[PDB]
Design a protein around this ligand. Structure first.
Ligand SMILES: CCCCCCCCO[C@@H]1O[C@H](CO)[C@@H](O)[C@H](O)[C@H]1O
Ligand SMILES: CCCCCCCCO[C@@H]1O[C@H](CO)[C@@H](O)[C@H](O)[C@H]1O
Ligand SMILES: CCCCCCCCO[C@@H]1O[C@H](CO)[C@@H](O)[C@H](O)[C@H]1O
Ligand SMILES: O[C@]1(c2ccc(Cl)cc2)c2ccccc2C2=NCCN21
Ligand code: NA
Ligand code: NA
Length: 504
């Protein structure tokens, strides 16, 4: 079995998995909307009661499976629970990261495309008033993606966007086809320091921003001034538990799969804690110091609330690019911003495609080359739905990327700590540990963590599911149809896997 070569490489690949575009865009917007500095109270709590416990569990489950030659959840769930229904539930740990990959690699390609256009100067140059600067960049994005100009839900990506997507798939494959240590691990040791340098440069340059409308200090101010009155709102605590769960990449199968290349008695307690910490530091220190302070510096604290409500995507793809076109050397600044987002995405997508690759290798005995190429083929092909059908992306992101992962997070806990056995699970986590998990976490993992996840799941199911089902366009059924088909196909592959095993 492939293994991580060095402890540092393992930590950087895992941190690389967790650190993504959300760290630099989603987290700052969530924090501003949910109590500013006060948001750190439920955020740390969520990290301590949900993020950290579940992450350890996924590492444990992964390492446990890897020791027996299985890196994915259909086989691993079955090892923890010898039941047919365990294998079927395990398909979700293959289906979730596959579906997310189908839209994520494409979004990732946008950052590469924007980076290139900025570098060579193929970007708008306004002209005054805020909308006069924002609008040319809104149009730039819309022409790139091919946002529908009619009533048809049809996207028409530019030729540039399509080719960059091809290049982005190629880069992912280039890394993945080299394997865990010589591919994913090797790239982690380059990308994570590169990521750190890019962010630190941006933080310094953003902190120097001074405009007639404000400063970066005003931005840091608006973001970090506590509003403890928002702590009464349960939706702020839901937002925190959700933000932590998504930022750490829990429930995607990626962590389990990556952990399966950790040797049987190699530490996961300290390595896991360190990886999660890297993600948090990148999130609150770097992510919180770039996008929002930059936006508030240029548009003024008066528009801070409006900026936050316009969302993470507009901030990262419209607002910030517009600001850069109005700042000195902003052209090279825009390149760095999107180069940073690209590496953030790239380190996450290679990790997110590994479960499908590992399944083909482990259960269908494909060579790494064949497993990588076929996985890429399925993802490349399916992505055409995301590129050409308006709102298809959102539909996939809701079922697999939002509802899916929390359901799968809960399923993991129950199978491991309740069905497999809490005592067997606890020993599995702490074995080989450089440090031991605090005894208090035995109760957290068993009662607190699933409770939190159960509550989040129900709240979101009651809140969002009726909306998606009743108020969306008929074309959502196309996306629902396709992704349900994918689940059928993966179930069949799992069916073929157990049949081959019966023969040999
Ligand atoms: C059917 C799934 C695989 C084939 C999908 C069709 C590929 C579409 O290819 C298209 O080529 C055009 C060149 O003019 C580009 O401008 C489009 O953006 C690109 O998507
Ligand atoms: C769901 C898979 C996506 C199908 C790929 C669309 C291929 C459409 O193909 C071409 O599209 C061009 C604009 O896109 C048009 O100029 C052409 O008339 C059309 O033939
Ligand atoms: C972390 C933030 C980056 C992810 C945000 C990408 C999601 C944006 O996807 C959106 O799909 C829409 C469908 O109607 C299009 O109209 C939008 O213009 C397109 O940006
Ligand atoms: O960027 C992801 C991720 C997950 C899977 C893939 Cl294939 C690609 C990227 C992601 C997407 C959506 C929601 C959360 C997360 C996430 N957390 C860590 C890496 N990662
Ligand atoms: Na993250
Ligand atoms: Na990443």
């Amino acid at each position: 079995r492939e293994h991580w070569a060095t402890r540092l490489g393992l930590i950087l690949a895992m941190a690389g998995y967790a650190v993504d575009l959300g760290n630099f865009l989603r987290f700052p917007v969530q924090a501003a909307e949910n109590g500013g500095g006060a948001f750190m109270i439920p955020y740390i709590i969520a990290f301590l009661l949900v993020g950290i416990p579940l992450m350890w569990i996924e590492w444990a489950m992964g390492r446990y499976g890897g020791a027996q030659g299985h890196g994915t959840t259909p086989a691993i769930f079955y090892l923890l629970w010898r039941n047919r229904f365990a294998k079927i539930l395990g398909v979700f740990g293959l289906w979730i990261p596959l579906v997310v990959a189908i839209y994520y690699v494409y979004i990732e390609s946008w950052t590469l495309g924007f980076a290139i256009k900025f570098l060579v100067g193929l970007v708008p140059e306004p002209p005054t008033d805020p909308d006069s600067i924002l609008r040319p960049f809104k149009e730039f994005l819309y022409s790139y993606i091919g946002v529908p100009k009619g009533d048809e839900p049809i996207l028409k990506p530019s030729l540039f966007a399509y080719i960059v997507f091809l290049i982005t798939m190629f880069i992912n494959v280039s890394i993945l086809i080299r394997g865990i240590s010589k591919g994913i691990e090797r790239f982690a040791k380059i990308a994570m320091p590169t990521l750190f340098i890019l962010a630190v440069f941006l933080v310094i340059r953003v902190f120097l921003l001074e405009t007639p409308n404000g400063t970066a200090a005003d931005g840091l101010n608006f973001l970090w001034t506590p509003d403890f009155e928002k702590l009464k709102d349960p939706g702020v605590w839901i937002a925190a538990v959700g933000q932590i769960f998504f930022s750490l990449g829990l429930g995607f199968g990626a962590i389990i799969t990556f952990a399966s290349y950790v040797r049987k008695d190699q530490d996961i307690v300290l390595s896991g804690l360190t990886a999660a910490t890297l993600n948090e530091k990148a999130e609150v220190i770097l992510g919180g110091s770039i996008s929002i302070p930059a936006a508030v510096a240029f548009f003024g604290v008066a528009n801070a609330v409006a900026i936050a409500k316009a969302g993470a995507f507009n901030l990262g793809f419209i607002t910030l690019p517009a600001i850069f076109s109005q700042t000195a050397g902003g052209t090279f600044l825009g390149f760095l911003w999107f180069f940073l987002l690209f590496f953030a995405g790239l380190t996450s997508s290679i990790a997110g495609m590994q479960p499908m690759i590992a399944f083909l290798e482990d259960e269908l005995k494909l060579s790494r080359k064949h497993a990588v190429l076929w996985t890429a083929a399925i993802v490349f092909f399916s992505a055409h739905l995301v590129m050409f059908l308006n709102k298809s992306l959102d539909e996939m992101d809701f079922w697999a990327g939002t509802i899916g992962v929390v359901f799968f997070g809960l399923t993991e806990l129950i199978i491991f700590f309740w069905i497999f056995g809490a005592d067997k699970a606890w020993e599995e986590i702490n074995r080989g540990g450089i440090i031991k998990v605090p005894r208090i976490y035995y109760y957290v993992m068993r009662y607190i963590t699933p409770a939190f996840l159960a509550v989040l799941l129900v709240v979101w199911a009651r809140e969002y599911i009726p909306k998606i089902m009743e108020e969306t366009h008929w074309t959502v059924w196309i996306t629902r149809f396709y992704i349900i088909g994918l689940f059928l196909f993966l179930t069949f592959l799992v069916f073929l896997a157990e049949r081959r095993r019966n023969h040999e």
